[PDB]
From Swiss-Prot, chains A, B:
Gene: lovB
Practical and industrial applications: Lovastatin acts as a hypolipidemic agent that works as inhibitor of (3S)-hydroxymethylglutaryl-coenzyme A (HMG-CoA) reductase (HMGR) which reduces HMG-CoA to mevalonate and is the key step in cholesterol biosynthesis. Lovastatin, simvastatin and related compounds are widely used to treat hypercholesteremia and reduce the risk of cardiovascular disease. Furthermore, statins such as lovastatin were found to be anticancer agents.
Quaternary structure note: Homodimer. Each MAT domain from the lovB homodimer binds one lovC molecule to form the final active lovB-lovC megasynthase complex.
Designated name of the protein: Lovastatin nonaketide synthase, polyketide synthase component
Superkingdom: Eukaryota
Domain notes: Multidomain protein; including a ketosynthase (KS) that catalyzes repeated decarboxylative condensation to elongate the polyketide backbone; a malonyl-CoA:ACP transacylase (MAT) that selects and transfers the extender unit malonyl-CoA; a dehydratase (DH) domain that reduces hydroxyl groups to enoyl groups; a methyltransferase (CMeT) domain responsible for the incorporation of methyl groups; a ketoreductase (KR) domain that catalyzes beta-ketoreduction steps; and an acyl-carrier protein (ACP) that serves as the tether of the growing and completed polyketide via its phosphopantetheinyl arm. Lacks an enoylreductase (ER) domain that reduces enoyl groups to alkyl group which function is performed by the trans-acting enoyl reductase lovC via its binding to the MAT domain of lovB.
Function: Lovastatin nonaketide synthase; part of the gene cluster that mediates the biosynthesis of lovastatin (also known as mevinolin, mevacor or monacolin K), a hypolipidemic inhibitor of (3S)-hydroxymethylglutaryl-coenzyme A (HMG-CoA) reductase (HMGR). The first step in the biosynthesis of lovastatin is the production of dihydromonacolin L acid by the lovastatin nonaketide synthase lovB and the trans-acting enoyl reductase lovC (called the lovB-lovC megasynthase complex) via condensation of one acetyl-CoA unit and 8 malonyl-CoA units.
Length: 52, 52
C-alpha cells in the first residue's frame, strides 16, 4: 500500500511540477487514489486541479 | 522587417519560456532569422539551444 501511495504521489507531483506555469489544469481518468492525491497536491501548490 | 523580427523573437521567447525547466533543447527547421534569434535567446537565458 505504501508503495502504491508513493507512486501515486510521484505521478501527482510530476504533473504539478512539469506544468507549474498554469492557474488551472485538468487530469483525465486518473486512479481514484491518484485523483485524491492530485487534488491534495493542487491544494498545496495552489493549482486548480480538475478531475475527469 | 521590424514586424518580422519581433514575430521571430515572440516565437523564440515563447519557446524559451514555456520550457524554462530544461538545460538543453532542440529546435527543428526554424526560420533562419528564427534560428539566429533562438540562439540569442538561449544565450541570454542560459539555455543550450540546438538548431536543426
Amino acid at each position: 500500500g505504501g508503495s502504491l501511495m508513493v507512486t501515486v504521489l510521484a505521478a501527482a507531483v510530476l504533473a504539478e511540477t512539469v506544468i507549474s506555469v498554469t492557474d488551472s489544469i485538468l487530469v483525465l481518468n486518473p486512479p481514484s487514489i491518484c485523483g485524491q492525491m492530485l487534488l491534495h497536491a493542487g491544494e498545496e501548490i495552489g493549482l486548480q486541479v480538475h478531475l475527469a
